[PDB]
């Protein structure tokens, strides 16, 4: 009756758009496709690679619940964007938690700087930070035992584009993209960027707060022309890339991957 | 002749023939060479190789001036564009600036009519 109308606004009230409410129960597993049902119009074709943790093998059997993401509806048939990004929000929440007590503590282990800041990895994910953040002083973890255990003390974060440089060792110590496009500029600043869509000439890795990068086909590997970028890297994956070129005018930052 | 350390190389690259002219920084031409002059005619002189050899010839010609530094100004569309500069480099000048100086009007004069072939 209005039973159904009320039930509709009820079901509106008991779901939200992003990957927030851990609701999809894994109702069929087959390599290489997981699939859930979070109270959406259809079931997700999940990769297996959004769900294996830190050494390669699966972690969740039938009935298990992770939220995914949304705001994109129907490409022909199907429903979602991946739950792994979901996870990013959780990471953001832990990073935010720092603010409360002015100190987020986990483990951060940063061996080296792709682009001037040691890389820190938290749980499954690994992030890149600006060069200062790795060390509190001028200590430098190059003399430290390789891939050492500390935590991360945050030095610097870019707040829009996601780059976070964190503080290893020293426990005792405690319009918008395009005007100032000189931060990752200078010749070869390495970046960690998720690829988006590979347009048979390109790969379109673009992460640093509303920009566009290409890594088109010529570098990508150490073979030139026979490569076909879909075979050689991925879809949706955070990779090794650096700038090689910026035009701040005809917004074409032309990144590379042969480095 | 007065020796000069730094100068310009003007590379007039047409569809039919490349012309390389080495000059001082002020404008006064020191030497020049062409693909047509280098012993290439018609099909041959409208090629990168021809351009390169013209460039080489030009370089040879301005040996007595003792030119070390060189800025390149590349004009027009042609094969003799990249090749010529490479040749120049080989000949052994420190290439300082590489400028493009193609005359692009901002819609000015009417071009000649389109060929019917």
């Amino acid at each position: 009756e209005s039973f159904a109308q009320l039930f509709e606004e009820s079901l509106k009230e008991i779901e939200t758009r992003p990957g927030s409410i851990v609701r999809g129960v894994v109702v069929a597993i087959d390599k290489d496709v997981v699939l859930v049902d979070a109270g959406l119009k259809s079931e997700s074709a999940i990769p297996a690679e959004q769900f294996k943790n830190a050494q390669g093998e699966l972690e969740i059997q039938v009935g298990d619940e992770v939220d995914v993401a949304l705001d994109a509806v129907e490409d022909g048939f199907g429903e979602t964007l991946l739950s792994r990004e979901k996870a990013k929000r959780h990471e953001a929440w832990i990073t935010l938690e720092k603010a409360y007590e002015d100190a987020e503590t986990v483990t951060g282990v940063i061996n080296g700087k792709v682009k001037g800041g040691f890389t820190v990895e938290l749980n499954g994910i690994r992030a890149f930070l600006p060069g200062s953040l790795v060390d509190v002083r001028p200590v430098r973890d190059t003399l430290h035992l390789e891939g050492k255990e500390l935590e991360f003390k945050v030095i610097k974060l870019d707040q829009k584009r996601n780059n976070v440089v964190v503080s290893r060792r020293a426990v005792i110590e405690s319009e918008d993209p395009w005007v100032a496009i000189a931060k990752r500029y200078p010749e070869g600043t390495k970046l960690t960027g998720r690829v988006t869509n590979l347009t048979d000439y390109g790969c379109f890795v673009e992460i640093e707060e509303g920009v566009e990068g290409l890594v088109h086909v010529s570098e990508m590997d150490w073979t030139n022309k026979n490569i076909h970028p879909s075979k050689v890297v991925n879809v949706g994956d955070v990779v090794e890339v650096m700038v090689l070129d910026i035009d701040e005018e005809r917004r074409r930052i032309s990144l590379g991957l042969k480095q | 002749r007065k020796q000069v350390s730094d100068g310009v190389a003007h590379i007039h690259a047409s569809f039919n023939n490349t012309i390389v002219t080495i000059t001082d920084r002020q404008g006064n031409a020191l030497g020049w060479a062409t693909a047509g002059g280098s012993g290439f005619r018609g099909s041959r002189k409208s090629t990168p190789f021809a351009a390169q050899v013209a460039a080489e010839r030009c370089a040879d010609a301005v040996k007595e001036y003792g030119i070390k530094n060189l800025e390149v100004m590349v004009k027009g569309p042609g094969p003799g564009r990249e090749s010529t500069i490479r040749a120049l480099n080989a000949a052994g000048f420190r290439i300082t600036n590489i400028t493009d100086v193609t005359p692009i009007p901002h819609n000015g004069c009417r071009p000649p009519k389109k060929r019917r072939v």
Partner: protein
Amino acid sequence: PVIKVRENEPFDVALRRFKRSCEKAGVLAEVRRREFYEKPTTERKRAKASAVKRHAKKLARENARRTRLY
């Protein structure tokens, strides 16, 4: 496309950079375009035709894609 060779920069690299700059400018293309007079009508026609082609590529092909080849 004005360029200056950086200190301890290779020649080849510089050349490549220059080429890239030129490409960006679209100087050669521009030159090609202005070689001969294009009647206004012709210009119009090309533009519209090109647009049409683009549209065809975008939508019809997308529709095709939905169905598998084998």
